[PDB]
Amino acid sequence: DTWTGVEALIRILQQLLFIHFRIGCRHSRIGIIQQRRTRNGASKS
Amino acid sequence: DTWTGVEALIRILQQLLFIHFRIGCRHSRIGIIQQRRTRNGASKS
């Protein structure tokens, strides 16, 4: 596990960051796609 | 230290490996440069 614990830690850390920035500084709205969730709660009709 | 502890850990781990391979799988003989260290110990003259 000497290097196998580092090489996989070299990517595991880079992999995570790759998500934090692509999901924290520019996450996508997968799901809404032009469709507000009826606001927080505007009753119905 | 959330990311600052990861981004620097993403490189610190890649940086180290960069050395292990360039100093463990192909280290340089900086110092000898065509000059065996008089063998392990062949006395003198």
XYZ file of N, CA and C in Angstrom:
270
model
N 0.853 -1.224 0.000
C 0.000 0.000 0.000
C 0.875 1.256 0.000
N 2.169 1.089 0.018
C 3.074 2.274 0.020
C 2.637 3.275 -1.054
N 2.904 2.981 -2.296
C 2.503 3.916 -3.386
C 1.042 3.701 -3.747
N 0.640 2.476 -3.857
C -0.785 2.196 -4.189
C -1.690 3.003 -3.258
N -1.175 3.393 -2.125
C -1.986 4.197 -1.169
C -1.792 5.680 -1.484
N -0.780 5.999 -2.243
C -0.530 7.420 -2.605
C -1.078 7.692 -4.008
N -0.660 6.927 -4.982
C -1.172 7.144 -6.365
C -2.700 7.205 -6.344
N -3.336 6.295 -5.655
C -4.824 6.329 -5.590
C -5.258 7.508 -4.719
N -4.369 8.004 -3.901
C -4.709 9.172 -3.052
C -4.399 10.432 -3.849
N -3.535 10.304 -4.821
C -3.193 11.466 -5.675
C -4.387 11.761 -6.576
N -5.035 10.721 -7.022
C -6.219 10.890 -7.906
C -7.483 11.039 -7.075
N -7.624 10.251 -6.052
C -8.850 10.354 -5.230
C -9.037 11.800 -4.770
N -7.964 12.475 -4.468
C -8.084 13.889 -4.026
C -8.348 14.775 -5.240
N -7.680 14.513 -6.331
C -7.928 15.324 -7.553
C -9.329 14.997 -8.072
N -9.700 13.744 -8.027
C -11.058 13.354 -8.489
C -12.106 14.123 -7.681
N -12.040 14.051 -6.376
C -13.033 14.790 -5.546
C -13.078 16.258 -5.975
N -11.986 16.962 -5.847
C -11.973 18.391 -6.259
C -12.661 18.547 -7.615
N -12.300 17.732 -8.567
C -12.940 17.828 -9.909
C -14.459 17.914 -9.753
N -14.994 17.283 -8.743
C -16.468 17.328 -8.527
C -16.846 18.613 -7.783
N -16.202 18.878 -6.682
C -16.522 20.109 -5.903
C -16.612 21.330 -6.826
N -15.673 21.489 -7.718
C -15.708 22.670 -8.629
C -16.793 22.494 -9.702
N -16.964 21.301 -10.202
C -18.001 21.077 -11.252
C -19.372 20.835 -10.610
N -19.439 20.839 -9.307
C -20.748 20.613 -8.625
C -20.938 21.622 -7.490
N -19.969 22.464 -7.260
C -20.100 23.473 -6.174
C -19.921 24.868 -6.766
N -19.098 24.990 -7.769
C -18.883 26.322 -8.398
C -19.622 26.393 -9.735
N -20.231 25.314 -10.144
C -20.972 25.323 -11.437
C -21.845 24.072 -11.560
N -22.401 23.614 -10.472
C -23.266 22.401 -10.533
C -24.330 22.566 -11.620
N -24.846 21.483 -12.129
C -25.886 21.579 -13.192
C -27.282 21.398 -12.587
N -28.287 21.944 -13.215
C -29.670 21.801 -12.675
C -30.343 20.560 -13.267
N -29.651 19.454 -13.294
C -30.250 18.211 -13.857
C -31.557 17.877 -13.131
N -32.670 18.014 -13.800
C -33.972 17.704 -13.148
C -34.974 18.820 -13.452
N -34.658 20.030 -13.082
C -35.593 21.160 -13.351
C -35.747 21.372 -14.859
N -34.681 21.705 -15.533
C -34.767 21.924 -17.006
C -35.971 22.809 -17.338
N -35.898 24.072 -17.015
C -37.040 24.985 -17.313
C -38.308 24.493 -16.612
N -38.351 24.590 -15.310
C -39.560 24.127 -14.568
C -39.406 24.420 -13.074
N -39.555 25.657 -12.682
C -39.417 26.005 -11.240
C -40.235 25.036 -10.381
N -39.726 24.664 -9.240
C -40.474 23.722 -8.359
C -41.667 24.433 -7.715
N -42.608 24.870 -8.513
C -43.805 25.575 -7.961
C -43.405 26.483 -6.794
N -42.280 27.136 -6.895
C -41.839 28.036 -5.790
C -41.729 27.251 -4.481
N -41.411 27.915 -3.404
C -41.288 27.204 -2.098
C -42.630 26.576 -1.711
N -43.702 27.302 -1.866
C -45.037 26.746 -1.506
C -46.119 27.793 -1.776
N -46.581 27.885 -2.993
C -47.635 28.888 -3.318
C -49.011 28.218 -3.345
N -49.262 27.318 -2.434
C -50.584 26.630 -2.409
C -50.886 26.014 -3.777
N -52.129 25.719 -4.045
C -52.486 25.117 -5.362
C -53.712 25.821 -5.950
N -53.597 26.331 -7.146
C -54.756 27.030 -7.773
C -55.385 28.010 -6.778
N -9.351 25.037 5.619
C -8.446 23.923 5.209
C -9.232 22.858 4.440
N -10.511 23.056 4.274
C -11.329 22.053 3.533
C -10.632 21.664 2.226
N -10.665 22.524 1.246
C -10.003 22.203 -0.051
C -8.516 22.496 0.035
N -8.169 23.606 0.601
C -6.725 23.947 0.735
C -5.977 22.754 1.334
N -6.682 21.897 2.017
C -6.033 20.700 2.619
C -6.079 19.554 1.608
N -6.899 19.679 0.601
C -6.992 18.614 -0.433
C -6.163 19.016 -1.654
N -6.422 20.171 -2.209
C -5.635 20.614 -3.396
C -4.140 20.481 -3.100
N -3.707 20.924 -1.952
C -2.261 20.796 -1.613
C -1.942 19.327 -1.337
N -2.947 18.544 -1.049
C -2.714 17.097 -0.806
C -2.790 16.383 -2.149
N -3.449 16.996 -3.095
C -3.547 16.396 -4.447
C -2.186 16.511 -5.118
N -1.522 17.606 -4.878
C -0.180 17.824 -5.479
C 0.902 17.242 -4.583
N 0.792 17.443 -3.303
C 1.836 16.905 -2.402
C 2.010 15.408 -2.656
N 0.938 14.719 -2.932
C 1.046 13.261 -3.198
C 1.596 13.047 -4.606
N 1.146 13.827 -5.551
C 1.673 13.682 -6.933
C 3.129 14.153 -6.941
N 3.411 15.215 -6.234
C 4.810 15.716 -6.173
C 5.720 14.611 -5.636
N 5.392 14.058 -4.496
C 6.241 12.968 -3.934
C 6.454 11.879 -4.989
N 5.398 11.248 -5.430
C 5.548 10.189 -6.462
C 6.500 10.664 -7.561
N 6.289 11.850 -8.066
C 7.186 12.374 -9.132
C 8.647 12.156 -8.734
N 8.935 12.206 -7.463
C 10.337 11.998 -7.003
C 10.633 10.498 -6.898
N 9.799 9.772 -6.208
C 10.028 8.304 -6.058
C 10.367 7.667 -7.410
N 9.634 7.993 -8.440
C 9.916 7.386 -9.773
C 11.180 8.002 -10.392
N 11.380 9.280 -10.220
C 12.589 9.927 -10.807
C 13.789 9.773 -9.867
N 13.597 9.149 -8.738
C 14.731 8.965 -7.784
C 14.750 7.530 -7.249
N 13.803 6.724 -7.645
C 13.773 5.315 -7.165
C 13.796 4.378 -8.369
N 13.194 4.784 -9.453
C 13.183 3.923 -10.667
C 14.176 4.462 -11.699
N 14.791 5.577 -11.415
C 15.772 6.149 -12.380
C 16.581 7.269 -11.719
N 16.884 7.129 -10.457
C 17.673 8.185 -9.760
C 18.940 8.507 -10.559
N 19.483 9.678 -10.376
C 20.718 10.052 -11.125
C 21.953 9.861 -10.240
N 23.092 9.634 -10.836
C 24.331 9.439 -10.029
C 25.037 10.781 -9.812
N 24.301 11.797 -9.450
C 24.929 13.130 -9.224
C 26.045 13.019 -8.182
N 27.274 13.168 -8.597
C 28.402 13.071 -7.628
C 29.506 12.189 -8.216
N 29.192 10.965 -8.537
C 30.224 10.057 -9.114
C 30.685 10.579 -10.477
N 29.793 10.655 -11.427
C 30.182 11.157 -12.776
C 31.477 10.483 -13.239
N 31.413 9.223 -13.574
C 32.641 8.511 -14.034
C 33.714 8.552 -12.944
N 33.505 7.848 -11.864
C 34.515 7.847 -10.768
C 34.086 6.888 -9.655
N 34.223 5.609 -9.876
C 33.822 4.624 -8.830
C 34.399 5.031 -7.472
N 33.653 4.837 -6.419
C 34.157 5.215 -5.068
C 35.238 4.230 -4.613
N 36.341 4.181 -5.315
C 37.443 3.245 -4.934
C 36.873 1.912 -4.443
N 35.829 1.437 -5.066
C 35.229 0.142 -4.633
C 34.818 0.216 -3.160
N 34.330 -0.866 -2.615
C 33.913 -0.857 -1.184
C 35.113 -0.550 -0.285
N 36.236 -1.161 -0.546
C 37.439 -0.903 0.293
C 38.609 -1.746 -0.217
N 39.308 -1.269 -1.210
C 40.460 -2.044 -1.752
C 41.775 -1.504 -1.183
N 41.789 -1.157 0.075
C 43.040 -0.624 0.687
C 43.571 0.554 -0.134
N 44.823 0.884 0.027
C 45.398 2.023 -0.746
C 46.754 1.628 -1.338
N 46.908 1.751 -2.627
C 48.206 1.383 -3.264
C 48.679 0.022 -2.748
